[PDB]
Amino acid sequence: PMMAEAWEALRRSMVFFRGQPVGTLAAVDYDQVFVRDFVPSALAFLMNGEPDIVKHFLLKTLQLQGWEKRVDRFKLGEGVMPASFKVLHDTDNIVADFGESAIGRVAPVDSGFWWIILLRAYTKSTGDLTLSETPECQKGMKLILSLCLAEGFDTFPTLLCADGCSMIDRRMGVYGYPIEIQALFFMALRSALSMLKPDGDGREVIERIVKRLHALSFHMRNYFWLDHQNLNDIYRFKTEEYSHTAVNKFNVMPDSIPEWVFDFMPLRGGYFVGNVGPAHMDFRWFALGNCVSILSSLATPDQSMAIMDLLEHRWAELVGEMPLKICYPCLEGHEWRIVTGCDPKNTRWSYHNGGSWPVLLWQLTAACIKTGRPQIARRAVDLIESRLHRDCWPEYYDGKLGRYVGKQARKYQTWSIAGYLVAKMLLEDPSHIGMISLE
Amino acid sequence: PMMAEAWEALRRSMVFFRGQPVGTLAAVDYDQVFVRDFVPSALAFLMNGEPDIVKHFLLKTLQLQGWEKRVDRFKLGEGVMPASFKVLHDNIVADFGESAIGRVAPVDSGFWWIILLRAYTKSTGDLTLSETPECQKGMKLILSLCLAEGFDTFPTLLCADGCSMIDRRMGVYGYPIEIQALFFMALRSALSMLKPDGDGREVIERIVKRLHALSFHMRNYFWLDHQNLNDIYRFKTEEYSHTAVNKFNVMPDSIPEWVFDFMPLRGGYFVGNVGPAHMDFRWFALGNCVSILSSLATPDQSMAIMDLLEHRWAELVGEMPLKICYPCLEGHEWRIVTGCDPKNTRWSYHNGGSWPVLLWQLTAACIKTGRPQIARRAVDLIESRLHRDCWPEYYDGKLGRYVGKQARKYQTWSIAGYLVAKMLLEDPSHIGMISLE
Amino acid sequence: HPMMAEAWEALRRSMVFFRGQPVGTLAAVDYDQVFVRDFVPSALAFLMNGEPDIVKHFLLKTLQLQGWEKRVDRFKLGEGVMPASFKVLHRETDNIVADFGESAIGRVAPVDSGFWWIILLRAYTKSTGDLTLSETPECQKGMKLILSLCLAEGFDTFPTLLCADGCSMIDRRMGVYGYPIEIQALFFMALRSALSMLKPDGDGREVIERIVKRLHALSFHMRNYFWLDHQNLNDIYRFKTEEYSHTAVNKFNVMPDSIPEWVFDFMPLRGGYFVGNVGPAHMDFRWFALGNCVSILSSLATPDQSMAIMDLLEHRWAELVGEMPLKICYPCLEGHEWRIVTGCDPKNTRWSYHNGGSWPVLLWQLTAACIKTGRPQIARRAVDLIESRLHRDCWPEYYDGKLGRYVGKQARKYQTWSIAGYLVAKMLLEDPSHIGMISLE
C-alpha cells in the first residue's frame, strides 16, 4: 500500500554510531535522537523483527545516564535521563542534552519512564530476558526509580512537576500533577516490576514500588476520574472543609469550573482530568494521558469503555478532520496570556495549545485494541491515510478540526511517520498490544 | 510604657502540655500551635529571657516528626514537620496536610524548625540542646528531604501551590523566593550546629555544595534592578545553547506594565519566581527580608532593597506595614491564578494584604542593613492603629486603611511581631540571633 | 565640554564615500544604508560646521537615483519617486543600489523622502548662499518631478495628501494612513521651500501657480480643522451629526461620543496642538512631535499657535517628554487598539518604537522650533536631560517607557541620526542665527 513510502522515510532517518544503529532522527529536512521521538520508531522496528536498534539505543542512553551532568553550579541527579543526543564526525562522538541546552531549561521527566517502558517492550517483543537482567539495565531502573520514589514534603502520591516536564516542553502549564506524567509513572512502575531482580536493596525497592502503585491506583481512579455524575457532585461541592474527613478534599471552587466542561460532558462516557493539586484542577482532556492510563490498566475496564464512549460522542472535538488533538480545549486571550506567558508558538488551536498531532495515532490505536473497539482506530487510520502522505508528513496540524498544517510544523517528521507505521502494524496484528500494555 | 499590653496578650496565648509551656496559640478569640505563627512568639520569649517554651516546642515538634503519617494510602516523608498541632484534654494531635484545607503541604515548617533551633542556641549559648542526638536526627531528616536527588535541573526547591504563609492557590508554585530564602537560611544555620560524626561529614559536604549553587542562582537570576529589567526587556527568544543569554526563555513582551513603572532608578529586589519560561515579577516581603537576614543578598543588594523600600514606600507599606506582596491579582489574573478564590480578593488576605506580623522581619532586616530609621517609621506608623483595632490578623486595601475582610482580632503572631520589632529596635545586639554573615 | 567632540567622532566615522566622493552618512554604526530622513540631521550638522560638500553630493546623487527605472512586480513606479535609502557595493570598486519600496518590509512607500530632499536643498542654498546648485537644470527638474507627483489631480476632495500606512518616519502600520500631520507639514514646508528656489522659465510660471494655489488651500485647511485647543475641543464635543449641506458645522461628521477619554484630560487650559489626522468621519487625536515641529518651522502654525504648542509642552511635559526627549507620539495604542490598528505588530508594543517611544533624534526639531518661538529654556532643559544619559547608553536608537527611562526593546546602539540631532540642537543653541536655514516666515 502507500505505507511502504513511510518505511522508506523511517529507514532514511536512522542514526548510526560506530556502525551500530543508535536511533532515529527527529526530523529529516529537531536534528538529533530524542527519546519520546524514538519510542514509536522503536516499536515499529520491534514489530517488524529488527530489535537491534532498540538494543543499542537503550544501552547508549543508559551510558548517558552515567555521565557527570552539571548546570551552572548544580550537579544533576544520578538517574537523570537525557532528553536528546546528537552524533558528530570530522571520529564519531555523542553529545547529550539533559536540560542545560534545552530552551527554557525544561526537565525531561518522561524520558526515564519511556526508557523503562521501552525496555519492557523490547524484552516482551523479543523474549530475550538477558538485556533486562544485565547489571547495567538494573542499575538504570533503580536509578530512575530512586529519583521519583524518594520521599519529600509531598502530600500527594503523584509526582510533582515543573512546567514543560512532558511532551509539552513549553509553559502550558503542565506543572503539578499532569495526567501525562502520572500515567507514564504508573506504566513505568508496573513495567519495572515485570523485569526487576531483587538484590539486597532490590527487594526493598520492589516493596516501595508496590506501595506507591497502590497509592497511585487509588488517587488516580478516585480523584482524576471525571464523568457526568462526578462532575455534578463537584458542582454541588461545599468549600472550606478543614478536617481529616472532608468531601471536597482539595478545596476546588465549584464556581471556578469552566463553562465548557458542562457542555462538553456527555451523558455516557468520561475521562481523566488533566491535573489535580492543592486548590487546583485542570479540566483539560489530554490524549496521551488517557491513552497511557488505558494501556497501563490504570483505568478500569469500565473507565476505558467510558473513554471510548466519550471519544465517539465528542469525536469532532477530540479528533476532527485530523487525529489526534493533543489537548481539548485550547487557551485563548487572557488564559493564553497568563498560563502560557504570551508564548507565540502555542497560539489558538496550535502546536501544544489544541493542535492535532498525527504521532498520537498509534497510542489511540493501541488503547482501542486493548478496549476492544478497533473500529475507532480504523476510522482514525482512514482519516490519516488520506492526508498525511499528501502533506509530506507534517509535525503537527492546527485548527479546530486540524484542516490546516501547523504554523511551524516540520515536514517529514520522523515520529509522525513511525506512529502511522506502528498503528497499521497493530491493526494488522493485535497480538502486539501485549508489548505495550498491562493488565 | 503602654506597650506591655501586647505582652499580656502574648502570655495569655500560651499552650501548656503536662504542666510545662509548649507554645503559643494562633488566634485568641487558626486555633492550634502553628510553626510559622510561633516563630515570632519564640523570638520574643528568647529576647525576654524565657527560653524554656522554645525548647519544649522544638522537642515536641521533633517527636511529632517521628510519627507515622498517612494520607489515604500514601506514606508522607520521614522528616516531614507538622504544620500545626493542638492539645486535647492530655494528648497531642498534629496536622501534616491530611486535615489542611486543600491538602496543602507545609514546606517551610522544616526550615523554620532549624532556624528556631539556631536562634535558641545563639540566644542562650546552651549548645547542649543542638548537640542532642534527637535534634541532630531531625536536622538530618529535614535536610535529606530537600537535598534529595530528582529530575530537577534547578538548584532551587520545587514547590506546589500553597507552600508557605499562603496556604491557598496564589501562584507560589515552582521556586518562590520565600521558600528559597528560608531554604538558604536553614542550610546556613544547619552547618552552625551539625556535628561531623558518622553521616555528618557526608551531609555537610552536600549542604556546602548546594549552598554554592543557590548563592549564585539567586544573585544572578532572581535579582532585579533597573538595569537588569532593561536587559530582560531587550532579550532574544528561542535560545538553544549552553551559552544562551535568555536562559529560561522568558518572553519580553509578557513582562507586565506595572514592573516598568514600579522600578525606580535606585534600588532593586528579588523576583518572586523563576522557572521554565516562568518569571513572577511580584515583590514578596518575607522572601526579601530573609534574603537580607541570611546574607544571601550582597550588601549592595540589601542597600538596594532598602532604597526601593524608601522610594516606593506607599506601595510596599502604605498606611499599614507590611504588604505580603505587591501588586495584587485583579480580574482575569485573579480568576486564573487563584482559581476564583474569594478569600484572596483585591488587596486582601494573601493577594496584596497588609500583614502586621511582617514588621519584625522588616525591623531585623533594617538593623542588619544599617537603616534603623525605616523600621522606626514603620513602628511609629503601626503603633497608632494596631492596638486600637484589637490586633487584627491582616489589613486590606491599597494602603491598608481597612481591616481584613475575614481578619481575626487578637492574632497571636500579629502581637508577637510588634513586640519582637520593638525589642530589636531597643537592642540591636539581638539581630545575631536571627542573622548570618 | 568636549562631549560634542565624541559625538563628532561618531558622526565622522559614519561617513559614506562613493568612488572617492562623500555621498552620505550611514544609519547605524555597529538600518545599515544611507536613509534620507536619517541623513537630514547629519547634513544640517555639516552645513552648520562649514562642510557642505557632502550635502551637495548627496542631493546630486539622490537626484540621479530619481532618474532611474523603478519597477515593482509589473508596475512602473513614478518618475519623481525618490528612494528611501541606498547602499554602496564595495572593497575596491563601488556600485549604487537603491531601495524605492521593493525591498522595504511591507512594501512601504517613502513619501517624506522627496519633501526632505527639497527642504535639504533649500537648507543648503541658505546655509552656503551658493544659489548655483538649486539653479542647475537637474535640480529644477527634480523639484518639478517631485512636485508633479503630489500636486497631481485626483478624486481627492481634500487639499491634503492621501497616504497609505507606513509612509512617514513611521515605516510600519500605525494608523498613519490618510492625512497625517507629519506628511502634511513636510508637504507645506517643501512647497514653500520650492517657491524659494524655483525659476519662472517656461513651465515654472505654470508650476509656481499650482504651488501657490495649493498653499492657500493647505494653510486654511490645516489652521481651521487640524488645530486643536481647549475651546476647539469643547466645540467638537458639542457637535451635531448628519450635516448634509454646504454650510455645515461638523464638516467631517465626527461622532462626539467617539472622542477618546484621554483627550479631555490631556488638553490643558493654556496651549494647543495639531491633531494627528483628519478625514471622512475619521479624526486621530494623537499628538505627533515631528508634525507640530515642522508646522512651527514652516510657519504653517500662526505665532499664537506656536506659542500654544510651547505652552502645552510646558504644561504636559512629563507626558510629551518625560525623562528622555522626545516622545514620537502621545499616547500609545494599548490592548484592543494595538491589536486592530497595528495588526498585532510586536515591534510597536506599549510605549515602544513607534507606539509612544522616546526618540532622541527629535531633539533638534524641538530645539529649532523653540528658537523660532522664543522659548530657549525648553530646549535647554531637554538638552540637559539628553546630555545626562544619551552618551552613557552608547547613543541608542530609541527609548521605551512612559518616561523613556528604559532603552529601546530593539534599539540599535550608536545610531547616526540620534547623535546628529544632538549636535544640531547644541549648534542651534550656541548660534540661533542658523534657524533661518530650517525655517520660513
Swiss-Prot record, chain B:
It comes from the Eukaryota. The keyword Transcription regulation does not apply. Expressed in radicle, hypocotyls, root tips and vascular cylinder, leaf vasculature, shoot stipules, trichomes, stem, stigma apex and base of siliques. It catalyses: Hydrolysis of terminal non-reducing beta-D-fructofuranoside residues in beta-D-fructofuranosides. Coiled coil: none annotated. GO terms for cellular component: cytosol; membrane; nucleus. GO terms for biological process: amino acid metabolic process; carbohydrate metabolic process; protein hexamerization; response to hydrogen peroxide; root development; sucrose catabolic process. Cytosolic invertase that specifically cleaves sucrose into glucose and fructose and is involved in the regulation of multiple tissue development including primary root elongation, root hair growth, leaf and silique development, and floral transition. Is involved in osmotic stress-induced inhibition on lateral root growth by controlling the concentration of hexose in cells. May regulate sugar-mediated root development by controlling sucrose catabolism in root cells. Contributes to carbon partitioning and cellulose biosynthesis in seedlings. GO terms for molecular function: beta-fructofuranosidase activity; endo-alpha-N-acetylgalactosaminidase activity; sucrose alpha-glucosidase activity. Disruption phenotype: Reduced primary root length and increased length and number of lateral roots. Reduced plant growth and early flowering. Reduced seedling levels of glucose and fructose, but increased levels of sucrose. Optimum pH is 7.0-8.0. It is found in: Cytoplasm, Cytosol; Nucleus. The gene is CINV1. Keywords: Acetylation, Carbohydrate metabolism, Cytoplasm, Glycosidase, Hydrolase, Nucleus, Phosphoprotein. Its EC number is 3.2.1.26. This is Alkaline/neutral invertase CINV1. Belongs to the glycosyl hydrolase 100 family. The chain holds residues 83 to 533 of 551 of the full protein. Optimum temperature is 9 degrees Celsius. It comes from Arabidopsis thaliana (Mouse-ear cress). Forms homohexamers. Interacts with PIP5K9. Interaction with PIP5K9 represses CINV1 activity. Induction: Induced by mannitol in roots. Induced by hydrogen peroxide. Induced by dark-to-light transition in roots. It is an enzyme of class 3 (hydrolase).
